[PDB]
Amino acid sequence: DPDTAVTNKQSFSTDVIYQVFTDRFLDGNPSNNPTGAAYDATCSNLKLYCGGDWQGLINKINDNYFSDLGVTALWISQPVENIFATINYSGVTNTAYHGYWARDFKKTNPYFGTMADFQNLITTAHAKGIKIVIDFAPNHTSPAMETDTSFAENGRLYDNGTLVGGYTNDTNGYFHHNGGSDFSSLENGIYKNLYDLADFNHNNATIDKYFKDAIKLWLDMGVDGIRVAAVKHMPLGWQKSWMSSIYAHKPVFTFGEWFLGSAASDADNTDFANKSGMSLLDFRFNSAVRNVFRDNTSNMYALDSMINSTATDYNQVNDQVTFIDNHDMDRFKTSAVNNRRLEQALAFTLTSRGVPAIYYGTEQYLTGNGDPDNRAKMPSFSKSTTAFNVISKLAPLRKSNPAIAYGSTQQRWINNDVYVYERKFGKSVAVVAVNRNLSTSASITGLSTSLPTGSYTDVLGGVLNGNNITSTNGSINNFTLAAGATAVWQYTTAETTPTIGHVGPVMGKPGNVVTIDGRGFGSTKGTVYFGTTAVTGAAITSWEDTQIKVTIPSVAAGNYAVKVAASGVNSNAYNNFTILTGDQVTVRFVVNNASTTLGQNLYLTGNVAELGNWSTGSTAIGPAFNQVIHQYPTWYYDVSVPAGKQLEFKFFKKNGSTITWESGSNHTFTTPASGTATVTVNWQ
Ligand SMILES: [Ca+2]
Ligand SMILES: [Ca+2]
């Protein structure tokens, strides 16, 4: 199979995700519409259900709307049975229309469709080569008051019909009853309630179990991707074991949302991308794209830096999911914002690095500020707009041109309102040119690309007032780029060298199988190098020019670079693959009596690669928490550690360069073969 083929769950770099709020798109079947309180036919009261559902998308896939737009994937609402109760928050009736106030993860949302309607979608989709991607919220159930069972469904979690338990009188401790997060730190954002939503207790072994079992269900119906919610509000440790269990079983591409407010590099957000075993929505690229194109607060320089810092921060920047907007900010088009500015923002995003998503009806230039006005009933299905045209012209290149799909990003020309940049993968090039200025045109003199000699026609055919150019050995002849114009001119040809485009997943134990997308690999089963170790023959499950699939060798766990060798010649090196010791379980380590100093923090390390392998660097886990579950001078932390292994660990205070250890002998611990566990040591 191709890297391109819908068959490929582990990479989305060649796709364009269409994100659609299921109930606001199209009501295909009206019999699975709510009754009364919870329902609005006319969808004027956006807090109510509007009747949209899975048969609605089906019908659209079939009359070629998605395929004509060129989107190759769809990201639907979390599908699980949500609370049926209507919650009246200060005068206004709220319904669980948005698919987030779940109540049974092992069942479907009847207003969206049945299990068979779900399967139906999976199939009408894969039929037209459109990958499906679901939302998933392992952080919580629904709203609830501990003093008040009467409020909503009191966070009640039912396992497949059978009630496991609600918020009030939670004798088992399935939930953090720690108050609600005030958000002053990371720690309080995790172990206290997200707003008024009943917070799961993951260190609880029923719930740890439930959630791994609830995703295998969905993966088994053939979802091709998982968009995780509120990842800043759950422990990384738990997210990592949950993930490793998924990759073990049915590796799909998984990206999470860690909300960010700016193009700025946030540390916890970056460490999350690199260590979690998942990718994130690209909130910092979003901040740049709105600043330069919508809001005129920043200029062409901002955009280029953002490109460069995200390229530097992220272990695999190409997995990150870019966007001009979504269901939690205001809609890009607003009355002052020009069409061409939305259109250029689209243009830009489709041609840029990472994985592009579009929130529904951006082809229809939809407005709506804040929530819910940013979530309206999808207005028309016209295939007539300039945004409709730009998306369908450009998003195909992600598949046909590997430079767009995996390539590098170079600046070739920039001033305050003009940006010309280049995407290159091996011999394939693409240059995008953009003048954001809607009144002055701009002479580009002295442009040098690494396009070969010839005349290159604007791929957009002039829909965005694109002109044509001529390369003479890269040097482009002088030209006026028009007002508000944008151009794309590209070049492809067959690679004849193994070159690793993508690898997915990037973290797993021995025995897991990964996918290596690329160009010029040939069809003669060669050798795959996990670092220094050749994998050959039968251990390689598939070998095709663009995609090799291969089992993880039983090497020591750690960070590895992956190379391919075809016909003797070796490919480029894809980095930061994480081989895990084995299966993982989340274990909470609690250290008492660990007084520190102003600004002295507490990490743990130990004898396995998951614990950093006696590191005091970026692999030592830390810093530990010490305000919510346990408090100073006790310190605690949740780690992803390997199932049933004896561990040797020690805590240490790190100040500047002053690492200062635990005295005595190493502490030791044998982990469970499944689940979660807790261990408590006294700082010695
Ligand atoms: Ca319906
Ligand atoms: Ca939480």
Short mmCIF file of C-alpha atoms in Angstrom, two decimals, residues 471-668:
data_model
loop_
_atom_site.label_atom_id
_atom_site.label_comp_id
_atom_site.label_asym_id
_atom_site.label_seq_id
_atom_site.Cartn_x
_atom_site.Cartn_y
_atom_site.Cartn_z
CA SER A 471 13.54 29.23 -13.00
CA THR A 472 16.95 29.53 -14.57
CA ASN A 473 18.75 27.27 -12.46
CA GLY A 474 16.83 28.33 -9.44
CA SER A 475 16.96 32.03 -10.04
CA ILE A 476 13.65 33.41 -10.67
CA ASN A 477 13.19 36.31 -12.96
CA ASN A 478 11.95 39.60 -11.62
CA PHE A 479 8.21 39.91 -11.09
CA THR A 480 5.37 41.77 -9.55
CA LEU A 481 3.41 39.68 -7.00
CA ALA A 482 -0.04 41.31 -7.05
CA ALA A 483 -2.08 42.80 -4.24
CA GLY A 484 -3.32 40.15 -1.88
CA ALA A 485 -1.93 37.57 -4.24
CA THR A 486 -0.65 34.13 -3.57
CA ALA A 487 1.11 31.78 -5.71
CA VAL A 488 2.22 28.14 -5.49
CA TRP A 489 4.55 26.72 -8.17
CA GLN A 490 5.94 23.13 -7.65
CA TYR A 491 8.13 20.38 -8.95
CA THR A 492 8.18 16.56 -8.52
CA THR A 493 10.04 13.56 -9.84
CA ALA A 494 10.91 10.07 -8.73
CA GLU A 495 13.25 9.66 -5.84
CA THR A 496 15.77 6.78 -6.35
CA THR A 497 17.28 6.84 -2.87
CA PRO A 498 15.66 5.53 0.32
CA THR A 499 14.46 8.65 2.12
CA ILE A 500 12.35 8.40 5.33
CA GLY A 501 9.45 10.74 5.13
CA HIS A 502 7.65 9.88 8.31
CA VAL A 503 7.72 7.15 10.93
CA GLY A 504 4.54 6.35 12.97
CA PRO A 505 4.10 5.56 15.87
CA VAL A 506 7.42 6.83 17.32
CA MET A 507 7.29 4.97 20.61
CA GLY A 508 6.60 1.31 21.46
CA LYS A 509 7.94 -1.94 23.07
CA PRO A 510 9.76 -4.85 21.17
CA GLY A 511 7.28 -6.72 19.01
CA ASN A 512 5.09 -3.62 18.09
CA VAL A 513 4.91 -2.77 14.36
CA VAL A 514 5.60 0.66 12.99
CA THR A 515 5.13 2.17 9.59
CA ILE A 516 7.83 4.09 7.74
CA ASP A 517 6.51 6.42 5.00
CA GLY A 518 8.98 7.85 2.50
CA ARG A 519 10.06 7.86 -1.11
CA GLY A 520 12.50 5.77 -3.22
CA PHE A 521 12.62 2.68 -0.94
CA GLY A 522 12.29 0.20 -3.85
CA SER A 523 10.47 -3.20 -3.58
CA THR A 524 13.25 -5.48 -2.49
CA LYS A 525 13.11 -6.18 1.16
CA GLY A 526 16.24 -4.55 2.42
CA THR A 527 17.33 -3.86 5.95
CA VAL A 528 15.68 -1.58 8.49
CA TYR A 529 18.06 -0.15 11.15
CA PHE A 530 16.74 0.53 14.65
CA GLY A 531 19.74 2.51 15.56
CA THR A 532 22.53 0.09 15.05
CA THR A 533 20.48 -3.07 14.70
CA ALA A 534 19.56 -4.51 11.33
CA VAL A 535 16.04 -5.83 10.94
CA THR A 536 15.66 -8.01 7.91
CA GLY A 537 13.62 -10.69 6.26
CA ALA A 538 10.54 -11.84 8.06
CA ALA A 539 10.76 -9.22 10.83
CA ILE A 540 9.92 -6.75 8.06
CA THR A 541 6.16 -7.33 7.49
CA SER A 542 5.83 -5.17 4.23
CA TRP A 543 8.24 -3.41 1.79
CA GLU A 544 7.03 -1.10 -0.87
CA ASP A 545 8.54 2.01 -2.43
CA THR A 546 6.71 4.31 -0.10
CA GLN A 547 6.01 2.24 2.99
CA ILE A 548 7.75 -0.31 5.06
CA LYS A 549 6.22 -1.97 8.03
CA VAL A 550 8.41 -3.51 10.70
CA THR A 551 8.40 -5.15 14.07
CA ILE A 552 10.36 -3.53 16.92
CA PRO A 553 13.58 -5.48 17.69
CA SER A 554 14.21 -6.63 21.27
CA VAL A 555 16.80 -3.97 21.98
CA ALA A 556 17.50 -2.24 25.30
CA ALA A 557 14.81 0.50 25.68
CA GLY A 558 15.81 4.04 24.75
CA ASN A 559 16.02 6.61 22.11
CA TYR A 560 16.83 5.42 18.63
CA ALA A 561 17.37 6.82 15.19
CA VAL A 562 15.78 4.76 12.32
CA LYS A 563 17.49 4.28 8.88
CA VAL A 564 16.47 2.23 5.84
CA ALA A 565 19.07 0.67 3.46
CA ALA A 566 17.96 0.03 -0.08
CA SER A 567 20.30 -1.33 -2.74
CA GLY A 568 23.23 -0.88 -0.34
CA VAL A 569 22.63 2.88 -0.02
CA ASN A 570 21.31 4.16 3.28
CA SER A 571 18.46 6.61 3.87
CA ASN A 572 18.34 9.64 6.08
CA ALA A 573 18.00 9.09 9.78
CA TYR A 574 14.55 9.58 11.42
CA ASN A 575 15.13 10.38 15.01
CA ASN A 576 13.78 9.96 18.52
CA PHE A 577 12.04 6.69 18.39
CA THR A 578 11.40 5.41 21.90
CA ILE A 579 11.74 1.69 22.47
CA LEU A 580 10.02 0.99 25.84
CA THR A 581 11.22 -1.94 28.10
CA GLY A 582 7.79 -3.65 27.67
CA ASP A 583 4.28 -3.22 28.67
CA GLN A 584 3.69 -0.14 31.01
CA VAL A 585 1.51 0.31 34.16
CA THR A 586 1.05 3.73 35.88
CA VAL A 587 2.77 3.75 39.31
CA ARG A 588 2.42 6.72 41.76
CA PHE A 589 5.79 7.28 43.70
CA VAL A 590 5.31 9.16 47.02
CA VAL A 591 8.34 10.45 48.91
CA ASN A 592 7.99 11.77 52.38
CA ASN A 593 10.20 14.08 54.27
CA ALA A 594 11.75 15.71 51.42
CA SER A 595 12.20 19.32 52.54
CA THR A 596 13.81 21.40 49.83
CA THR A 597 15.05 24.99 49.48
CA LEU A 598 13.83 28.03 47.72
CA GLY A 599 13.76 26.96 44.17
CA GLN A 600 14.99 23.38 44.80
CA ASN A 601 13.01 20.73 43.01
CA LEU A 602 12.59 16.97 43.21
CA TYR A 603 13.05 14.43 40.42
CA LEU A 604 13.19 10.59 40.46
CA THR A 605 15.41 8.35 38.44
CA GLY A 606 16.35 4.73 38.39
CA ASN A 607 17.45 1.59 36.75
CA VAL A 608 15.15 1.56 33.71
CA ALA A 609 15.00 3.55 30.48
CA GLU A 610 11.45 4.71 31.38
CA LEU A 611 12.85 6.25 34.68
CA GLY A 612 15.57 8.01 32.73
CA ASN A 613 18.15 5.24 33.41
CA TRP A 614 19.90 6.87 36.35
CA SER A 615 19.84 10.23 34.65
CA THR A 616 19.61 13.74 36.26
CA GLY A 617 19.01 15.18 32.78
CA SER A 618 15.81 15.58 30.72
CA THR A 619 15.02 11.91 31.15
CA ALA A 620 14.89 12.01 35.00
CA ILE A 621 11.24 12.29 35.83
CA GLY A 622 10.40 15.34 37.74
CA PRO A 623 9.67 17.76 39.02
CA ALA A 624 7.27 15.98 41.45
CA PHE A 625 4.02 17.38 42.66
CA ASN A 626 3.42 18.46 46.26
CA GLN A 627 0.32 20.59 46.65
CA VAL A 628 -2.84 18.53 45.88
CA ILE A 629 -2.93 14.67 46.49
CA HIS A 630 0.07 14.97 48.78
CA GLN A 631 1.56 18.14 50.09
CA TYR A 632 4.92 19.46 51.17
CA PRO A 633 7.06 18.07 52.52
CA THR A 634 5.69 14.89 50.92
CA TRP A 635 6.19 14.83 47.11
CA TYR A 636 4.51 12.49 44.61
CA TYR A 637 4.40 11.75 40.94
CA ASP A 638 2.66 9.46 38.48
CA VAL A 639 5.03 7.55 36.21
CA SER A 640 4.63 5.25 33.16
CA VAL A 641 6.70 2.34 34.31
CA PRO A 642 7.03 -1.32 32.89
CA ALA A 643 4.67 -4.11 33.97
CA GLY A 644 5.97 -6.67 36.49
CA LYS A 645 9.68 -5.60 36.72
CA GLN A 646 11.67 -4.99 39.86
CA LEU A 647 12.79 -1.37 39.92
CA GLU A 648 15.61 0.31 41.67
CA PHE A 649 14.93 4.02 42.02
CA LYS A 650 16.17 7.01 44.02
CA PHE A 651 14.86 10.62 44.42
CA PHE A 652 17.12 13.77 44.29
CA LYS A 653 16.85 17.49 44.74
CA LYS A 654 18.16 19.56 41.88
CA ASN A 655 18.82 23.14 42.33
CA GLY A 656 21.24 24.67 39.87
CA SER A 657 23.74 22.14 39.10
CA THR A 658 23.39 20.88 42.59
CA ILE A 659 22.09 17.45 42.26
CA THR A 660 21.85 16.12 45.77
CA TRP A 661 20.77 12.53 46.20
CA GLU A 662 19.03 10.27 48.57
CA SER A 663 21.50 8.77 50.95
CA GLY A 664 21.49 5.08 51.83
CA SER A 665 20.69 2.22 49.48
CA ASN A 666 18.62 2.37 46.39
CA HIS A 667 14.84 1.96 47.02
CA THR A 668 13.42 -1.03 45.22
#
